[PDB]
Write a protein that binds this ligand. Structure first.
Ligand SMILES: Cc1cc2nc3c(=O)[nH]c(=O)nc-3n(C[C@H](O)[C@H](O)[C@H](O)COP(=O)(O)OP(=O)(O)OC[C@H]3O[C@@H](n4cnc5c(N)ncnc54)[C@H](O)[C@@H]3O)c2cc1C
Ligand SMILES: CN1CCC[C@H]1c1cccnc1
Length: 432
């Protein structure tokens, strides 16, 4: 008799949902978390006196799985105001910064987006079966820049949507797969307004950590923190999991939910399938990071795009007041473009967009540097989505979940919740 029935690896949303599924089944469930905190690529902290989100935290009811979880646990929405900006700006790869006044900005970006996903519906009638139509399979041969070039856009709108998709790719759009973007838009209802409503509009009452804690308290599982898994060995119709302090924990099955980019630091015995190995060594493309700045001046509601060779690719105002000053929430698609390491560099680069600003405070998360994320959100490279199956397939008594392994909203929390549900299904399968 092994130590536990099931061992979940990773205290993210995927792992939390899997642990809940298997605990409600009455299995002896243990969850191991490398970091000293739960939530994984979601993390609520505080800066300059207020609550902030260094990772994922915005959800929507058009996302079925996490919304069902919120319903089950009674978690309401918290709406961030995103109405009538005071200044919308677009910075180009050459450093040019032009202030467009909102409505024109918004409608030209709508044009660029809709023409980018012109064939979304036909290519993806079933967003949850990404490669149902094989025309999506053939489009996975293409980049998103490949179609951006063939859509004949404005220079303004080309810059807009290319910075958008560089954010979504955590990379340069030349490496960004096309079918992933099209499928994500499909899941959103093939509609620009509805899909955009699921961007940075609604957060979870009590926070992503609130939902994580609800799921974990419910599951009844044992949660160990600051316990990294370094190796897994399938033996004896079960599995042995090795921690970084060389302790062995036996289980009937293990559900791996740690990000793809980190699989390279876990040794599997015997070796995983060849497609799984290829995926593990490729990983995914996103190299983003989160950054909050706080400057003396009040700049009101503000939004700003920046294309892929500028650093502060996504910028919006978190809060504003004549006395407090201004707080800038910012997402960077690639950490090699700006090192939030440097308050000098952050001040320089934000002054390039809001000339004459006094930087009071800085707070940053470099997800690319974190050993247990080695990247940000899921972002498929060219040709990856079409073989997603290899990453999903269970290998013996080893089950694989995680946002990157989901079929629907792969680039956000919902993908992780769906991963966990599927993992629980497979666990029930192999333990009944
Ligand atoms: C800046 C940013 C903004 C985002 N915005 C949103 C958003 O607004 N809305 C949204 O829905 N999603 C958003 N996303 C996506 C989102 O936060 C993630 O997709 C989601 O958390 C995926 O969860 P996961 O379980 O699949 O993986 P993770 O949450 O990363 O879970 C992996 C866990 O495994 C652990 N781990 C790794 N290696 C080991 C090991 N060897 N042993 C033990 N444990 C290990 C890690 O510590 C981590 O806790 C955002 C992400 C980022 C980074
Ligand atoms: C949650 N999204 C998934 C793709 C990129 C990420 C995102 C969206 C908006 C602002 N910052 C990050």
């Amino acid at each position: 008799g092994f130590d536990y029935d099931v061992v979940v690896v990773g205290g993210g949303f995927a792992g939390a949902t899997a642990a809940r599924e298997c605990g409600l089944q009455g299995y002896r469930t243990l969850l191991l978390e490398a970091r000293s905190r739960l939530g994984g690529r979601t993390f609520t902290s505080r800066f300059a006196g207020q609550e902030i989100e260094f990772g994922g935290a915005w959800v929507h009811w058009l996302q079925p799985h996490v919304w069902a979880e919120m319903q089950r646990y009674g978690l309401g929405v918290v709406e961030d105001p995103l109405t009538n900006l005071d200044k919308t700006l677009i910075m180009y790869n050459d450093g040019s910064v032009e202030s467009i006044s909102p409505d024109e900005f918004g409608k030209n970006i709508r044009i660029a987006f809709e023409k980018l996903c012109h064939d979304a519906w036909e290519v993806f009638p079933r967003p949850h079966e990404p490669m149902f139509t094989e025309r999506a399979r053939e489009l996975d041969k293409s980049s998103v820049l490949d179609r951006i070039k063939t859509l004949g856009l404005s220079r303004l709108q080309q810059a807009q949507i290319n910075s958008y998709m560089a954010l979504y790719a955590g990379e340069t759009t030349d490496k960004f797969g096309l079918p992933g973007v099209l499928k994500l838009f499909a899941c959103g209802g093939w509609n620009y307004d509805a899909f955009m409503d699921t961007e940075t509009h609604y957060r979870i009452q009590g926070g992503t950590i609130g939902l994580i804690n609800a799921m974990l308290t419910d599951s009844g599982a044992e949660v160990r923190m600051s316990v990294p898994v370094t190796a897994v060995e399938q033996v004896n119709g079960g599995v042995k999991i090795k921690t970084d302090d060389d302790e062995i924990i036996t289980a009937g099955v293990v559900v791996m939910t740690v990000p793809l980019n980190t699989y390279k630091h876990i040794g599997f015995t015997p070796a995983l399938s060849k497609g799984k190995q290829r995926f593990i060594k490729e990983g995914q493309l996103s190299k983003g990071a989160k950054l909050y700045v706080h400057v003396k001046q009040n700049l009101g509601r503000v939004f700003a795009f920046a294309d892929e060779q500028q650093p502060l690719n996504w910028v919006q105002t978190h809060d504003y007041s004549d006395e407090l000053g201004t707080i800038l929430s910012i997402t960077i698609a690639r950490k090699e473009t700006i090192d939030v390491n440097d308050r000098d560099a952050v001040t320089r680069e934000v002054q390039k967009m809001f000339p004459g600003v006094e930087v009071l405070g800085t707070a940053a998360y470099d997800w690319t540097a974190d050993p247990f994320s080695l990247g940000a959100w899921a972002a498929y490279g060219v040709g990856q989505l079409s073989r997603l199956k290899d990453l999903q397939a269970a290998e013996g008594r080893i089950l694989f979940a995680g946002a990157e392994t989901s079929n629907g909203w792969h680039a956000v929390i919902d993908g992780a919740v769906e991963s966990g549900l599927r993992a629980g299904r497979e666990v029930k399968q192999l333990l009944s």
